[PDB]
C-alpha cells in the first residue's frame, strides 16, 4: 500500500476542482508509473533469477483519497491489518460517492452491540472524510442520545453459574464475579417481589451501578429474555452507571485511530482565545 501524496501537492492541489478530476489525474499518474517502472524493477530480478520470462507483475487495483475540499484524514493505520480507507475506485470500478473499506476495528466485531457498531462505522466515515469538528459534534450527539436508550440493549450479556459458591448469607462473598455480584444484588433487591430466582447456567443482562446506591453495590443482573421488575426498575435506572460502559463500547476505538491519525476525540483547551 505505497502512500503517494507528494505527486498531488507537487502538481498543485489548486488545479483540481472536483474529486473526480483528482482521481483521474492520479489514475493517469499510476498508469504512466506502473508499467515502465515495474518492468525495469523486475527485468533485473528476472535476469538475476535466470528464468525464461518474468510473469511477475502488479496492477493499480485500489485507490483511496480524502474528499476534495474537506479536512478529513482520509486513511489512517491503527495496527497490523487493522485500518480504514476511503476507496474511490476498486479495480476500475469507480464510485460516484467514496466507499469506506474498514477492517480490524470493532465495527465488524460482534462482541459489541449492533447500534454501537453502526455508531463506530459512522464515526470512522466522519473522521476519514469530514474533519475534526464533525467527530466532536457526533461524539456529543451520541453521548446525549445514549443515556435514554433502552436498558435492554445496553446491558452486558453474561453467563450466571456457580452462584452458591460466591454468596455469603445472601451477600457478596470472596472473589465474587461481577456478573455473579449483579445476580446477588438482584436477588437481594427482588427479595419478596414474587419473581422466579436466577438459576445456575442461566444467562443474565448486567447493568452496572455507581457507588452509593441503596442496593449497596455496583452492579445488577437480571434473567435472560425478561425485564427488570417494575417496582425496582425506576430505582435501578436512576442509579445505573452507563458512563464506563459507553467508554468501553464506543470511546475505546476512537482513542486508537485519533492517536494514530493525528486527531483528537474531545477538546478542552483553547489555543485560539489567546494569540
Amino acid at each position: 500500500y505505497v502512500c503517494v501524496d507528494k505527486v498531488i501537492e507537487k502538481v498543485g492541489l489548486d488545479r483540481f476542482k472536483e474529486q473526480n478530476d483528482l482521481v483521474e489525474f492520479m489514475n493517469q499518474f499510476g498508469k504512466k508509473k506502473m508499467e515502465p517502472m515495474i518492468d525495469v524493477a523486475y527485468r533485473e530480478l528476472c535476469d538475476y533469477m535466470n528464468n525464461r520470462e518474468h510473469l511477475m507483475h502488479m496492477d493499480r487495483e485500489a485507490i483511496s483519497c480524502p474528499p476534495l475540499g474537506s479536512k478529513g484524514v482520509g486513511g489512517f493505520w491503527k495496527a497490523k491489518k487493522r485500518y480504514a480507507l476511503n476507496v474511490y475506485d476498486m479495480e476500475d470500478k469507480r464510485f460516484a460517492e467514496p466507499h469506506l473499506k474498514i477492517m480490524g476495528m470493532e465495527t465488524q466485531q460482534s462482541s459489541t452491540p449492533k447500534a454501537v457498531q453502526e455508531a463506530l462505522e459512522e464515526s470512522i466515515r466522519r473522521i476519514l472524510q469530514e474533519g475534526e469538528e464533525s467527530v466532536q459534534e457526533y461524539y456529543k450527539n451520541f453521548e446525549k442520545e445514549y443515556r435514554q436508550l433502552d436498558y435492554k440493549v445496553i446491558a452486558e450479556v453474561k453467563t450466571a453459574n456457580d452462584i452458591a459458591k460466591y454468596d455469603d448469607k445472601g451477600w457478596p462473598g470472596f472473589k465474587c464475579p461481577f456478573h455473579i455480584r449483579g445476580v446477588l444484588t438482584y436477588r437481594r433487591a427482588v427479595s419478596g417481589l414474587g419473581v422466579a430466582p436466577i438459576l445456575d447456567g442461566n444467562k443474565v443482562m448486567v447493568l452496572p451501578l455507581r457507588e452509593g446506591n441503596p442496593f449497596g453495590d455496583k452492579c445488577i443482573a437480571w434473567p435472560s429474555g425478561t425485564e427488570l421488575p417494575k417496582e425496582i426498575r425506576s430505582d435501578v435506572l436512576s442509579w445505573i452507571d452507563h458512563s464506563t460502559l459507553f467508554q468501553k463500547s464506543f470511546v475505546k476505538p476512537l482513542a486508537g485511530m485519533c492517536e494514530s491519525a493525528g486527531m483528537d476525540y474531545e477538546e478542552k483547551a483553547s489555543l485560539d482565545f489567546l494569540f
Binding site: 466532536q136 483547551a269 483553547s270 489555543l271 482565545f273 489567546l274 494569540f275
Partner: protein, 228 residues
C-alpha cells in the same frame, strides 16, 4: 543582566507554567503553556537586552539563586548564556527558540462579561484543599444572586453535578448567568489579591486572573454555558 528577587520569583512561576521561556528585549515577560491552555504574562521593572530561549528555566533559576543579585547575564561568545559575578562566571547553553513553545504578542482583553474579586487566603485555601479533596474541576457560576466558585470531581462524575467544596466569591447583580468550568491542572497563580475577568460569546470564552505582579489567562472546557 541584573534581576531582582521578585523577578526571579516571577520566572519560577513562569517555569511552573512552562518549562521553557522566551526573553525578548524589553521590560516584559511572557510564556504560554506547552499545550497553550494557559498563558502567563507580566511587566518587570528591569529591562532585557537580547531575546533568548531557555529550555530549563527552573534549573537556570536554581543556578542563578547561588550567585549575587548583581550578576550580569549576556550573550556569550560561544552562542550561549554568560553570567558574570564578582568572582564567578557561569556558562548556561541557550536553547533553540523552535524547541520551546514561543509566544508572539499579549492578548488585548475585550470587555469582560463578568468581573469578580478573590483574596490571597481564599485562593490559597482553594488550591491547598484541591489536592486533599482530589478535585480536578472548578465551576464558577451564580447561585442565589451570588457569584461563587465550586469544586467538582470530573473522574467520578463527568456530569459535574456533585458539589464537594464551594467558595463564595461575591455578589453578582445581573440576569446574565453563566457556568464556566476550569481544570485544576491549569491555573498556577502566586499568592495575592487577584481579579477575575470572564469573557464569553457562544462557544467562545476565556478567563483572566489579573494580579499585582503577573496576569494569567486560562481557557474553558466546551461544556461551559452562559446566557447574557
Amino acid at each position: 543582566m541584573k534581576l531582582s528577587k521578585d523577578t526571579t520569583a516571577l520566572l519560577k512561576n513562569f517555569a511552573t507554567i512552562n518549562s521553557g521561556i522566551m526573553l525578548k528585549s524589553g521590560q516584559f515577560i511572557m510564556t504560554r503553556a506547552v499545550n497553550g491552555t494557559t498563558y502567563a504574562e507580566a511587566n518587570i521593572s528591569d529591562v532585557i537586552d537580547f531575546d533568548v530561549a531557555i529550555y530549563d528555566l527552573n534549573g537556570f533559576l536554581g543556578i542563578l539563586s547561588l550567585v549575587n543579585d548583581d550578576a550580569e547575564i549576556s550573550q556569550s561568545e560561544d552562542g550561549n548564556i554568560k553570567i558574570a559575578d564578582a568572582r564567578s562566571t557561569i556558562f548556561w547553553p541557550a536553547a533553540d527558540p523552535s524547541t520551546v513553545v514561543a509566544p508572539n504578542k499579549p492578548i488585548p482583553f475585550p470587555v469582560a462579561s463578568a468581573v469578580t474579586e478573590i483574596k490571597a487566603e481564599d485562593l490559597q485555601q482553594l488550591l491547598r484543599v484541591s489536592r486533599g479533596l482530589q478535585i480536578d474541576t472548578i465551576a464558577i457560576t451564580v447561585k442565589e444572586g451570588k457569584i461563587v466558585i465550586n469544586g467538582f470531581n470530573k473522574v467520578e462524575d463527568s456530569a459535574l453535578t456533585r458539589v464537594k467544596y464551594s467558595l463564595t466569591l461575591g455578589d453578582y447583580d445581573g440576569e446574565n448567568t453563566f457556568n464556566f468550568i476550569i481544570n485544576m491542572a491549569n491555573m498556577k497563580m502566586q499568592p495575592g489579591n487577584y481579579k477575575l475577568l470572564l469573557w464569553a460569546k457562544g462557544k467562545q470564552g476565556a478567563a483572566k486572573f489579573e494580579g499585582e505582579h503577573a496576569n494569567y489567562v486560562v481557557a474553558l472546557e466546551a461544556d461551559s454555558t452562559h446566557d447574557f
